[PDB]
């Protein structure tokens, strides 16, 4: 199914990633909406970015 539990978990994980600016956050969210089938890969990249942006 297009908007499965997968898609849902990615949305709320990305929403709560701390090190993303707001622009980045809503960018990954827009991608999730524009292409639900790749929700897994969007989530990975968001974590990858969030983690690459921890202060100190």
From Swiss-Prot:
Q: Please state where this protein is localized.
A: Secreted, Cell wall
Per the record, what is it used for?
Answer: Important immunodiagnostic reagent because of its ability to bind the Fab and Fc fragments of a wide range of mammalian immunoglobulins.
**Record-annotated disulphide pairs:** none
Going by the entry's taxonomy, the superkingdom of the source organism is recorded as: Bacteria
Q: Where are the Immunoglobulin-binding region C repeats?
A: 1-56
Function in brief: Plays a role in the inhibition of the host innate and adaptive immune responses. Possesses five immunoglobulin-binding domains that capture both the fragment crystallizable region (Fc region) and the Fab region (part of Ig that identifies antigen) of immunoglobulins. In turn, Staphylococcus aureus is protected from phagocytic killing via inhibition of Ig Fc region. In addition, the host elicited B-cell response is prevented due to a decrease of antibody-secreting cell proliferation that enter the bone marrow, thereby decreasing long-term antibody production.
Q: How does it assemble?
A: Interacts with host TNFRSF1A; this interaction leads to the stimulation of both surface expression and shedding of TNFRSF1A.
Domain comment (free text): Each of the immunoglobulin-binding region repeats can bind the Fc region of an immunoglobulin.
Which family does the record claim for this protein?
Belongs to the immunoglobulin-binding protein SpA family.
What is the name of the protein in this document? Immunoglobulin G-binding protein A
């Amino acid at each position: 199914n297009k908007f499965n539990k997968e898609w849902q978990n990615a949305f709320y994980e990305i929403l709560h990633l701390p090190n993303l600016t707001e622009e980045q956050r809503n960018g990954f969210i827009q991608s999730l909406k524009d292409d639900p089938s790749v929700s897994k890969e969007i989530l990975a990249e968001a974590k990858k970015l969030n983690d690459a942006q921890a202060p100190k």
